[PDB]
Amino acid sequence: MKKLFLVFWWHMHQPLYREPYTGEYLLPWTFFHAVKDYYDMPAYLKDFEIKLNFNLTPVLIDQIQEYAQGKAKDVFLEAIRKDPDDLEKEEVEKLIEFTKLNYEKPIYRFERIRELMNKEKLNREELLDLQTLNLLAWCGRTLRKDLKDLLNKGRNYTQEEKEYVLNKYFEIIKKTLSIYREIKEEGKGSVSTSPYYHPLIPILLNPNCVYETTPNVKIPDFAVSFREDASKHVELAKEKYFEIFGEHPVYMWPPEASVSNEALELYYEKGINMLATDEVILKNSVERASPYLRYYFRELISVFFRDKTLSDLIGFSYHAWNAEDAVRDFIGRLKKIHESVDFQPVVFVVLDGENCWEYYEENGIPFLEKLYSTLEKEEWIETLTLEEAMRKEDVKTEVIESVKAGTWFDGNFLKWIGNKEKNEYWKILIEAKKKAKNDYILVAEGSDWFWWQGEEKAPFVEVFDKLFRSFVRRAQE
**Burial group, residue 204, by CB count within 10 angstroms (0-12, 13-18, 19+):** buried
- Report the distance separating Cα 62 and Cα 443, nearest Å: 12
Are 215 and 72 in contact by the 8 Å Cβ rule? The answer is: no
Tell me the CA distances in angstroms from 180 to 56, 169, 238, one per residue in order. Answer: 9, 17, 16
Are 219 and 418 in contact by the 8 Å Cβ rule? The answer is: yes
Resolution (A): 1.8
**Nearest C-alpha neighbor of 9 from the set 250, 282, 352, 476:** 352
Domain-embedded: residue 143: yes
Handedness of CA 406, 411, 412, 416 (dihedral sign): negative
Domain-embedded: residue 154: yes
Breaks (C-N over 2.5 A) in the chain follow: none
**Contact residues for 12 (Cβ-Cβ < 8 A; gap 6+):** 33, 37, 38, 41, 54, 55, 56, 57, 60, 352, 353, 354
Backbone angles phi and psi of 400, in degrees to 5:
-125, 140
- Report the distance separating Cα 26 and Cα 19, nearest Å: 7
For residue 67, the tally of other CB atoms under 10 A from its CB is 21
**Nearest C-alpha neighbor of 413 from the set 467, 461, 441, 451:** 451
For residue 4, the tally of other CB atoms under 10 A from its CB is 20
Domain-embedded: residue 19: no
Handedness of CA 423, 226, 284, 335 (dihedral sign): negative
Domain-embedded: residue 190: no
- Report the distance separating Cα 427 and Cα 425, nearest Å: 5
- Report the distance separating Cα 149 and Cα 139, nearest Å: 13
Are 474 and 20 in contact by the 8 Å Cβ rule? The answer is: yes
- The experimental method, as deposited, was X-ray
User: Position 262: which residue type?
Assistant: E
User: Position 159: which residue type?
Assistant: Q
Domain-embedded: residue 181: no
Domain-embedded: residue 91: yes
In what order do the strands lie in the sheet containing 274-278? 251-252, 274-278, 301-306, 294-297, 397-400
**Contact residues for 70 (Cβ-Cβ < 8 A; gap 6+):** 170
Backbone angles phi and psi of 325, in degrees to 5:
-65, -40
Are 445 and 197 in contact by the 8 Å Cβ rule? The answer is: yes
Which residues lie across from 191 on neighbouring strands?
Answer: 54
**Burial group, residue 458, by CB count within 10 angstroms (0-12, 13-18, 19+):** exposed
- Report the distance separating Cα 387 and Cα 385, nearest Å: 5
- Report the distance separating Cα 201 and Cα 267, nearest Å: 10
Task: Give CA 193 to chain center in angstroms.
Answer: 11
Domain span at residue 89 reads 71-169
- Report the distance separating Cα 328 and Cα 450, nearest Å: 38
- Report the distance separating Cα 466 and Cα 20, nearest Å: 11
Give the total number of structural domains in the chain.
1
Tell me the CA distances in angstroms from 149 to 71, 107, 158, one per residue in order. Answer: 30, 17, 13
3-state secondary structure the chain: CCCEEEEEEEEECCCCCECCCCCEECCCHHHHHHHHHHCHHHHHHHCCCCCCEEEECHHHHHHHHHHHCCCCEEHHHHHHHCCHHHCCHHHHHHHHHHHHHHCCCHHHCCHHHHHHCCCCCCCHHHHHHHHHHHHHHCCCCCHHHHCHHHHHHCCCCCHHHHHHHHHHHHHHHHCHHHHHHHHHHCCCCCEEECCCCCECHHHHHCHHHHHHCCCCCCCCCCCCCCHHHHHHHHHHHHHHHHHHHCCCCCEECCHHHCECHHHHHHHHHCCCCEEEEEHHHHHHHCCCCCCCCEEEECCCEEEEEECHHHHHHHHHHHHHCCHHHHHHHHHHHHHHHHHHCCCCCEEEEEEECCCCHHHCHHHHHHHHHHHHHHHHHCCCEEECCHHHHHHCCCCCEEEECCCCCECCCCCCCCCCCCCHHHHHHHHHHHHHHHCCCCCHHHHHCEHHHHHHCCCCCCCCHHHHHHHHHHHHHHCCC
**Contact residues for 17 (Cβ-Cβ < 8 A; gap 6+):** 25, 26, 27, 28, 29, 30, 63, 467
**Burial group, residue 270, by CB count within 10 angstroms (0-12, 13-18, 19+):** middle
Are 199 and 208 in contact by the 8 Å Cβ rule? The answer is: no
Instruction: Report the residue count for the chain.
Output: 477
Q: How many CA atoms lie within 13 A of 72 on its CB side?
A: 28
Domain-embedded: residue 228: no
Domain-embedded: residue 111: yes
Which residues lie across from 397 on neighbouring strands?
Answer: 294
**Burial group, residue 341, by CB count within 10 angstroms (0-12, 13-18, 19+):** middle
Backbone angles phi and psi of 228, in degrees to 5:
-70, -40
Are 199 and 233 in contact by the 8 Å Cβ rule? The answer is: yes
- Report the distance separating Cα 431 and Cα 454, nearest Å: 20
